[PDB]
């Protein structure tokens, strides 16, 4: 019987994770869950799952849950405040948590769980994409289990061999038979549209943030961040492949030759379900892979010249965890400004570009350290804009 | 530094897993080697890995391999007949086994190597697909680890969980989290030949015993045969699907809704040196899949209308050992019938059924039983053949 902490429970993945727990009442238990400010739907799963806690963002929304709590009778106890959701994630008889807070404000909560040594289902990108060297050692020293919830890492952690799961961070690919880490992606919606053409894009042709991240790979290029601190991957033991079905949704490549591959339907109730009843499975409720009503798989090399946030997130890693906490910064900027028609589309990436040249700084060595460096290429970003409208 | 006897060591099988051996000569050392006739190849080996014996079918062979070995003054200690092969898979301080030996003549040695619990890379049809029933009881009592060499079932294996992986063909599928077990195939030359014009087609047009066997796809339902007893699936477990491009060796549902997938280049030095480092890895000296050069993947179900000898297979497998003892024997026949210009291709699957249905008899219990089934249905094939010349 595992019992579970979820943060970020009335999001997108949250609710997901309550519908495996949902499906699978015999084991898991919600212990704890922990949203923002949606108190709508809080009180719905806290009558539902019925968890010892429930934790919000602030004081007005925990007042007001601790009302609509109260008249439905529900015994639920309502806190409050980053510090009540790091409690969450360390609470003692708490087997699993799912961090799935995202943002900077994920990165204490998932942190605690760590140092208190839980097992991690991983659903957020500020996690390693901003604190990887801080987090990863927090792992070593607590060996606590992260098991990534992402579709692409869960796929490359599915087709990774035992040894370097048990120890992941910390165990050496090439010692256990591995080459390298089949990273994949759609490609985005722009993937046929001819180069000098990507200038006159706009944001109804992408139909939000993460589409636009689809669209310029920069969420690939935050996963091959991810997915060298994740696996321990050295930059020739990574590849990055276009597979625009992505019902592949990642592989690893071994000394032999063969190449191990996780497929299925888009439905992260799979990789959720994954996670969570590792070693072993449940049912997700997730339709089983048909592979008769397929579209044919076709593979293909990323042209660097149609997606660059892709190249800068690389060279960015090389660059250390600084630069890689200024361009998820500085790309949340330039999205955004593209998606308000501040910018044209081709701007988001000479835009992250500039906010990274022109930027010199010192590696983080902590989370405030890393969310400095955040505010500070944010407002490099907010400004470079401008420099444009 | 495992050490190991090759049955049939002279074959095909057997001269890439030399070829594995050859470049990690580090993890592996061969004690002994067993050939059919081929004294020629067989000095050559033995004068390269210099074995502590080899052996062959006959005496003949075997003081004129003895005189060869001589000269080149080769310690290698020549032995021969089927004593000396099952000898050779039971030595002392042989760790695996290479059980490529392929016909009836290769069911005692493997056996031997069993019940010795030895670690056996099969390689090799007839153990499953005859005394499927009698060797994995075997394995049960030996606890001798099978690791699969041929293609498909490697897939498969790579793609199942570390707990079925351990305890192979004693493990229970579903209480592991396994849905069904997915058996690819690519359907043979004749896949998109109509219907109405199969009868028609010739041994130029199938370019051989293998080739006809794809194209009646006789070879995948001996595959469905062996799946069933090696990875202790039901029949519910099991699914058929026509993989045209054949990148895409095998994979393994899940009850998440993951499918885990093998991928590779058709050379047979990755799965031989999978099941040789299992649990590590090697290099086989094999080139890295170019995902970039594929042809598009596509799957589609069988039409058993196309294939009736899956089809029969299939029952033939309900119908048990004695009726798949007798589907591989009859097909040798008529294949070969086939071949000569006897019948027409599509009396290979017609003789078959024939075959089956004009013989009733009782399940095998030895290794003789199965060799009587074998030669009663070879007669009732054998003489099927010449009702049609
Ligand atoms: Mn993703
Ligand atoms: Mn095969």
Same mark, same amino acid.
């Not at 993937?191 to 991240?213: F, G, H, N, W």
């Not at 696996?231 to 000394?255: D, G, T, W």
């Given at each position: ?19 495996? #727990? ?7 238990? #919600? #212990?704890?869950? @922990?949203?923002?400010?949606?108190? =709508? ?36 106890? @309502? ?27 994920? /990165? ?10 839980? +097992? ?57 038979? !591995?080459?390298?880490?089949?990273? +994949? ?13 990507? &200038? +006159? ?10 589409? #636009? ?26 590849? !990055? ?10 592989? %690893? ?21 994954? =996670? ?9 409720? %997730? ?30 890693? *090389? ?7 200024? /361009? ?5 900027? =330039? %999205? ?30 902590? %989370? ?10 944010? *407002?490099? &970003? ?8």
């Amino acid at each position: 019987m595992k019992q579970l902490t979820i943060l970020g429970s009335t999001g997108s993945i949250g609710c997901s994770t309550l519908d495996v #727990v949902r499906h699978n009442p015999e084991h898991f238990r #919600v #212990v704890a869950l @922990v949203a923002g400010k949606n108190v =709508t739907r809080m009180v719905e799963q806290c009558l539902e799952f019925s968890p010892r806690y429930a934790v919000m963002d602030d004081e007005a929304s925990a007042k007001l849950l601790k009302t609509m709590l109260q008249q439905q009778g529900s015994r639920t106890e @309502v806190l409050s405040g980053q510090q009540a959701a790091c409690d969450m994630a360390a609470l003692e008889d708490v087997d699993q948590v799912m961090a799935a807070i995202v943002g900077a404000a994920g /990165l204490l909560p998932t942190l605690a769980a760590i140092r208190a040594g839980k +097992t991690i289902l991983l659903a957020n990108k500020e996690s390693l994409v901003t604190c990887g060297r801080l987090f990863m050692d927090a792992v070593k020293q607590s060996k606590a289990q992260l098991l990534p919830v992402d579709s692409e890492h869960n796929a490359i952690f599915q087709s990774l061999p035992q040894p370097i799961q048990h120890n992941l961070g910390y165990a050496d690919l090439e010692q256990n038979g !591995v080459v390298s880490i089949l990273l +994949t992606g759609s490609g985005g919606p722009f993937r046929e549209t001819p180069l000098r053409d990507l &200038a +006159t894009m706009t944001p109804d042709q992408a139909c939000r943030k993460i589409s #636009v991240d689809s669209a310029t790979m920069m969420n690939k290029g935050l996963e091959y961040i991810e997915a060298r601190w994740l696996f321990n991957a050295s930059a020739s033991q990574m590849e !990055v492949l276009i597979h625009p079905q992505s019902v592949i949704h990642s592989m %690893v490549r071994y000394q032999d030759g063969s190449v191990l591959a996780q497929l299925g339907e888009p439905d992260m109730r799979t990789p959720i379900a994954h =996670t969570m009843a590792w070693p072993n499975r449940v049912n997700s409720g %997730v339709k089983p892979l048909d592979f008769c009503k397929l579209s044919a798989l076709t593979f293909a090399a990323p042209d660097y010249d149609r997606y660059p946030c892709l190249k800068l997130a690389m060279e960015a890693f *090389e660059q250390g965890q600084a630069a890689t906490t200024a /361009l998820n910064a500085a790309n949340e900027i =330039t %999205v955004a400004a593209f998606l308000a028609q501040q910018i044209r589309f081709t701007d988001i990436a000479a835009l992250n570009l500039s906010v990274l040249e022109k930027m010199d700084m010192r590696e983080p060595q902590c %989370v405030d350290d890393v969310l400095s460096v955040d505010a500070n290429a944010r *407002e490099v &970003a907010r400004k470079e804009v401008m420099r444009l409208a």
